[PDB]
Amino acid sequence: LDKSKVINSALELLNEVGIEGLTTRKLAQKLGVEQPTLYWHVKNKRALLDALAIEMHDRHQTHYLPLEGESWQDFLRNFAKSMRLALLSHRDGAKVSLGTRWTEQQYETAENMLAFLTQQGFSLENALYATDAVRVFTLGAVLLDQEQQVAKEERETPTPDSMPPLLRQAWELKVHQGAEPAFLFGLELIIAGLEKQLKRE
Amino acid sequence: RLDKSKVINSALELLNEVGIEGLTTRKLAQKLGVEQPTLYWHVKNKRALLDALAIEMHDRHQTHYLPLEGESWQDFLRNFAKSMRLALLSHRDGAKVSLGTRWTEQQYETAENMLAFLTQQGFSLENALYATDAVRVFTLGAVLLDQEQQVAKEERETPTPDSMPPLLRQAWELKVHQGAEPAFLFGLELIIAGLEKQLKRES
Ligand SMILES: COc1nc(C)nc(NC(=O)NS(=O)(=O)c2ccccc2Cl)n1
Ligand SMILES: COc1nc(C)nc(NC(=O)NS(=O)(=O)c2ccccc2Cl)n1
């Protein structure tokens, strides 16, 4: 009947059945309680996903708050990288986090994040869209990689010899790129744009 | 007599009815009123179905894969991202349908001409490739988040703005009233400005 045991079991079930197979019914079953028992901790699948996402980001310490002396640039880098590693620590992590939003218990943290960026000279709007850009990019990079790896198993492999010369060279790079370098390339573009943006402002 | 276009039209309607998770070739054949081998000639499996749905969405909604005459690379990437976004938004789970795709052989000339264009404008082949991939990833991400949040919205209590701190309240107001397009355009402009900084560094 403990929140913590509910969440630990649910994380285990996530890894066993993935996000699409997860239900409150199967969690009640794995826990051995009557639906209304579970209901009081987790009212529906959506609330279960929301709780799972809070737990993942908490336990992997997604970097929501800047350290003293941390530049805004490094702060956004650390936020992205730590979020990414939190998402990659659980089956369908990115999918679980895709639908989340700040809970009331997180409003102080969220406010402090925006306060930090606006203290650097970003407008509220720009601080907001910066954080959102880093979030959606990070989600997109993880989700695209995951799905590309499934998809290439359900389709004939491409034939390199059929590729015209630039594309062939492109193909060869991407064979070797790795997920983390793709992610970091985009991340750095975003940070560099924000710097330019902050100067102009 | 079943034509490919009918398969695709009907599959796009079924996508809207049941979503990407619920879409199956069995349900499509039932919808078309045909036996399973008749459909199979057109789409061998669910992956082939998604591949063909993505191609149709991007074709119909005129995703900007080809630069205009005299178009700058900046305007090219803006138009690519924006048009791709609207294509993904045209159908339920549209971003998820495009998420697993890759160039087909029939698109290799398109993809070549895109790399030729970007290198002509002064990018290395490597940075031309990674630029396009970063814009694509950002655009998929934005629409993934938009479409999932649309569903999530109806499965939980709505927040209470009056209990929010000042800056977060201002943020909430912005997102509720301006919707997802300004946030998307902001991030796109960041990527373009980052790419300009990259050309300067490689000067
Ligand atoms: C940027 O990381 C992050 N993480 C979460 C969990 N949510 C958000 N943004 C968010 O929730 N935005 S919102 O528009 O849905 C919102 C909800 C409640 C209060 C304020 C706001 Cl802006 N970003
Ligand atoms: C940039 O928009 C876009 N659209 C599609 C459909 N695919 C891609 N990229 C892509 O397919 N990359 S790839 O590495 O899997 C590839 C496959 C075949 C030949 C070359 C390459 Cl690079 N981008």
Q: Between B181-202 and A179-200, two packed helices, what is the crossing angle to 10 degrees?
A: 100
Distance CA A19, CA B188 (A): 30
Q: Chain B neighbours among A 170-199 (CB < 8 Å)?
A: 170, 173-174, 182, 185-186, 188-197
Residue burial A2-38, b: 16+ Cβ < 10 Å; e: rest:
eeeebbeebbebbeeeebeebebeebbeebebeeeeb
Ligand 1 atom closest to the CA of B171, numbered from 1: 22
The answer to whether B24 touches B46, Cβ cutoff 8 Å, is: yes
User: What resolution in angstrom units was achieved for this structure?
Assistant: 2.0
Ligand 2 pocket list (CB less than 6 A): A 158, 163, 167, 170-171, 174; B 101-103, 132, 136
Task: Provide the 3-class DSSP secondary structure of residue B67.
Answer: coil
Q: Chain B neighbours among A 29-48 (CB < 8 Å)?
A: 44-47
The minimal CB distance from A143 to the residues B46, B144, B190 is found for B144
The answer to whether A126 touches A201, Cβ cutoff 8 Å, is: yes
Distance CA A43, CA A75 (A): 35
Kindly list the structural domains of chain B, giving each domain's residue range(s) and its CATH number in brackets, ordered by start.
67-202 (1.10.357.10)
Q: Which of B101, B103, B114 is nearest to B66 (CA)?
A: B114
- Residue B9 is classified by DSSP as H
Q: What is the 3-state secondary structure (H, E, C) of chain A?
A: CCHHHHHHHHHHHHHHHHHHHCCHHHHHHHHCCCHHHHHCCCCCHHHHHHHHHHHHHHHCCCCCCCCCCCCHHHHHHHHHHHHHHHHCCCCCHHHHHHCCCCCHHHHHHHHHHHHHHHHCCCCHHHHHHHHHHHHHHHHHHHHHHHHHHHHCCCCCCCCHHHCCHHHHHHHHHHHHHCHHHHHHHHHHHHHHHHHHHHHHC
Task: Provide the 3-class DSSP secondary structure of residue A71.
Answer: coil
- Which amino acid is it at A139? L
User: Chain A: residue nearest B118 by CA?
Assistant: A166
The token pair at A179 is 């997920």
User: Which residue owns the Cα nearest ligand 2 atom 12?
Assistant: B102
Distance CA B196, CA B203 (A): 10
Q: Chain A neighbours among B 134-173 (CB < 8 Å)?
A: 134, 136-142, 144-145, 148-149, 151-152, 155-156, 159-160, 163-168, 170-171
Experimental method of this PDB entry: X-ray
